[PDB]
Amino acid sequence: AKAAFDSLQASATEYIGYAWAMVVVIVGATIGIKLFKKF
DSSP states (O other), X not given: OXXXXXXXXXXXXXXXXXXXXXXXHHIIIIIIIXXXXXX
């Protein structure tokens, strides 16, 4: 959980971390979950 928290904080801070957490989180989740939904 600590490792996950590290990435989190980075996302909130780090530009790529945050954006990535969003853009990626959206892609992964959206694409992964949402992606698997449509395709």
